Amino acid sequence: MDLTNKNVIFVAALGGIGLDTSRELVKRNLKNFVILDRVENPTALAELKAINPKVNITFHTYDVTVPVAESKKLLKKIFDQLKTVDILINGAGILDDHQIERTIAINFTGLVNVTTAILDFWDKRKGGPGGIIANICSVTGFNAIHQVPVYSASKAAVVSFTNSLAKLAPITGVTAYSINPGITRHTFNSWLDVEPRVAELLLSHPTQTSEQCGQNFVKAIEANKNGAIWKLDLGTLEAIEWTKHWDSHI
Amino acid sequence: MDLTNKNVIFVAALGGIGLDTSRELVKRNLKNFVILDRVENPTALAELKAINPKVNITFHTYDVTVPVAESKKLLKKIFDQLKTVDILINGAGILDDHQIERTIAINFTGLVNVTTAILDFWDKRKGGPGGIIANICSVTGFNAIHQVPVYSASKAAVVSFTNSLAKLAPITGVTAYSINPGITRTPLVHTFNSWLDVEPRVAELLLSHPTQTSEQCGQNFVKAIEANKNGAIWKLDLGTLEAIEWTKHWDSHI
Ligand SMILES: NC(=O)c1ccc[n+]([C@@H]2O[C@H](COP(=O)([O-])OP(=O)(O)OC[C@H]3O[C@@H](n4cnc5c(N)ncnc54)[C@H](O)[C@@H]3O)[C@@H](O)[C@H]2O)c1
């Protein structure tokens, strides 16, 4: 994957790990960088545009928890303008096990919904060009932080969903892979307050900076491997192998 | 685990797997067996009672998609009556990838919510007695039926959640294990929808391969309950009961 002159939609582009990935992406001479986030950060947005003014950066206020139909309405406006979109990056997410419904709505349901929305524009069965989906999941989708069981479970779901998307690529023309960051250089809520110090404890352990998580993120996008399950931990980029415990035979 | 004299709540006890599990459960001399299901089934209820009149069987009309406060209200009613509950079984699920929100609400969120509610009565930090939770997940939580990605993902979520619950037992006093059937002959798999109709023949193709009976599944389910192994990930496929080992890809070190 050569990112030059490509059109990219990035959901939650101006947050923590999103912003540093975004900074590197706009340095790659994209034609369009389309940002969809819940709230505007005008300082960050201006800063992004200044990195390379030639890149068309557009911002849409977007809540990932809206129904599929609402996401399709926004996407139609984007496709009407750009004509083509090459990659969708899903980076929405919250970490707060005091918010059970919302954790699920944002991290899991929202990810499924926006994917379903864009498939209506990309599905090759209906004359669509196909496309690429990069889902920001989490290493907690492989093995949980058991003190944030709801967060971890939501990430396990999207690791699964991404895996299946990739296996459906021959039918849909839409490839996908997951980007799974380890702990990246603040305090949050554990489920039923089983551990009030999760953030303090995790951030003391060996971590990585948001800078070369973002650099490894772009490397992963460039590698463009359907069905990859990328681990981005301790400043390295590694593809993990999913264990086969069971087979549907279909 | 001796089931004699125990109090059991079973969410979704009257479906294909549920009813056959229930038939086996009441073979043991349970004290109270409390059924929560979405639709009343007076014939099945009568049948179970007849199996073992020593077991006290009650029924509540219950939808897992209600807010947690509502589930808490029902549990309080039950705990006030029985004083103690020994085991909770969370068995609700739908298979319909035309229903994204509902699949996730029933299969994942609803399971998390009943668990969260019952912890209020059981949590040893509150001076509760602890307890045991058996969660019906799915082999699809290990490896998807990719033509139903949403269902499979919802099951992956609950496998994860159950693993974590079990790891929290030393703190909460509440142990847990997953029950993961393979393809089992019930109405669930008779006819169903794939995501965006990627595979309109999915039910046909799946059932062209070997399956097990709900009877076999229910027998092995109760066997796993009696084994009572915290953190177990039980596979119930082709008539066998087998514990699987979850691969370690990453460790939080906490
Ligand atoms: N049949 C299989 O091959 C298979 C394989 C693996 C896992 N499972 C799982 O086993 C469980 C039982 O499935 P089944 O095969 O007996 O299917 P079923 O359709 O016969 O029964 C589903 C059960 O879930 C209940 N339910 C559905 N929605 C509910 C709601 N909103 N609130 C409360 N209860 C609700 C139903 O009333 C019923 O008791 C499900 O969780 C399913 O995902 C089934």
Side-chain angles (χ1 to χ4, degrees), chain A residues 65-68 100-101 104 108-109 112-113 115-116 119-120 123 125 139-150 152-154 156-158 160-161 163-165 167-168 171-172 182-183 191-195 198 201-202 205-206 231 233 240-250, chain B residues 66-68 100-101 104 108-109 112-113 115-116 119-120 123 125 139-150 152-154 156-158 160-161 163-165 167-168 171-172 182-183 195-199 202 205-206 208-210 235 237 244-254:
Chain A
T65 69
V66 297
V68 168
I100 293 163
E101 268 79 6
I104 299 167
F108 177 20
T109 314
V112 176
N113 278 344
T115 298
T116 302
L119 254 290
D120 214 10
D123 193 345
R125 295 177 292 161
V139 293
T140 68
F142 315 154
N143 305 88
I145 296 161
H146 63 270
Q147 300 96 332
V148 292
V150 188
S152 292
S154 73
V158 291
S160 173
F161 182 73
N163 283 165
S164 295
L165 278 186
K167 282 184 183 73
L168 289 173
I171 293 167
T172 62
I183 317 297
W191 179 69
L192 301 178
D193 293 322
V194 290
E195 180 54 81
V198 179
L201 296 165
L202 280 176
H205 279 284
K231 176 169 68 65
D233 196 34
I240 76 145
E241 184 193 343
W242 205 248
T243 306
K244 191 176 180 183
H245 295 282
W246 177 82
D247 190 351
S248 70
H249 308 119
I250 69 167
Chain B
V66 297
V68 65
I100 292 159
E101 263 94 354
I104 296 172
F108 175 23
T109 315
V112 176
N113 278 345
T115 298
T116 300
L119 258 287
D120 206 53
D123 192 347
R125 296 172 297 162
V139 289
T140 68
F142 313 158
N143 302 94
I145 293 167
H146 59 272
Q147 298 94 334
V148 287
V150 184
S152 289
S154 77
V158 293
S160 169
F161 183 72
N163 286 175
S164 297
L165 279 182
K167 283 176 174 65
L168 291 172
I171 295 178
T172 63
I183 317 303
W195 180 61
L196 307 181
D197 290 332
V198 289
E199 184 46 83
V202 58
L205 294 165
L206 190 71
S208 75
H209 307 283
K235 182 177 63 62
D237 192 29
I244 78 154
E245 296 298 299
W246 202 254
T247 309
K248 297 280 186 175
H249 298 286
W250 176 82
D251 188 3
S252 67
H253 304 297
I254 63 154

Side-chain angles (χ1 to χ4, degrees), chain B residues 11-18 36-39 62-65 91-94 102 106-107 136-139 151 155 179-189:
Chain B
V11 178
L14 302 181
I17 287 172
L36 278 56
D37 215 340
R38 199 187 66 87
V39 178
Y62 174 76
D63 188 334
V64 297
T65 60
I94 64 163
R102 190 178 273 276
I106 295 170
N107 296 5
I136 315 186
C137 306
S138 170
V139 289
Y151 177 82
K155 294 299 200 172
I179 300 289
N180 301 275
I183 317 303
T184 302
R185 300 196 292 272
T186 76
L188 192 83
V189 292

